């Protein structure tokens, strides 16, 4: 169990420093500024679906850019 | 950048992962009959580094969900 059980635990290291760690991530979170809240929201998880090309690095790629979002508002508000 | 480039953005970096993980057959190949303990062991090998960062949250959250769903079929 175990060697698999570190490859799955390191390759899952390596995706969230990749998110962590991505310019082009972090240039998004600097520069949005819509009125349009949720709207926006259903806009880019409708794009995702648009092509039938869904899958899992889409979903946490949208997770992660939707809550740190969510987390860097609430820093102040 | 905008709505359609945001877009465009998180489809590409999304697809880089899936182009570059091959991460569904990983998570099967540890022992999803048994997802607790998988789990632990997991957020702990992850969690041994000391660098905690928003990124691996969103990691193990999406193993979690993925380990209990294919938990549900064995």
Redesign the interface.
Known sequence: ?DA???????????????????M??Q??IA??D?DSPRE?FF??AA??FS?G?F???????????A??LV?KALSTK
């Open positions: 169990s698999s059980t570190k490859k799955l635990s390191e390759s899952l290291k390596r995706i969230g420093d990749e998110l962590d760690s991505n082009e991530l240039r998004m520069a949005v819509t926006v806009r880019v794009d995702m092509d090309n899958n899992w690095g889409r979903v946490v790629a949208l997770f992660y850019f809550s740190k987390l």
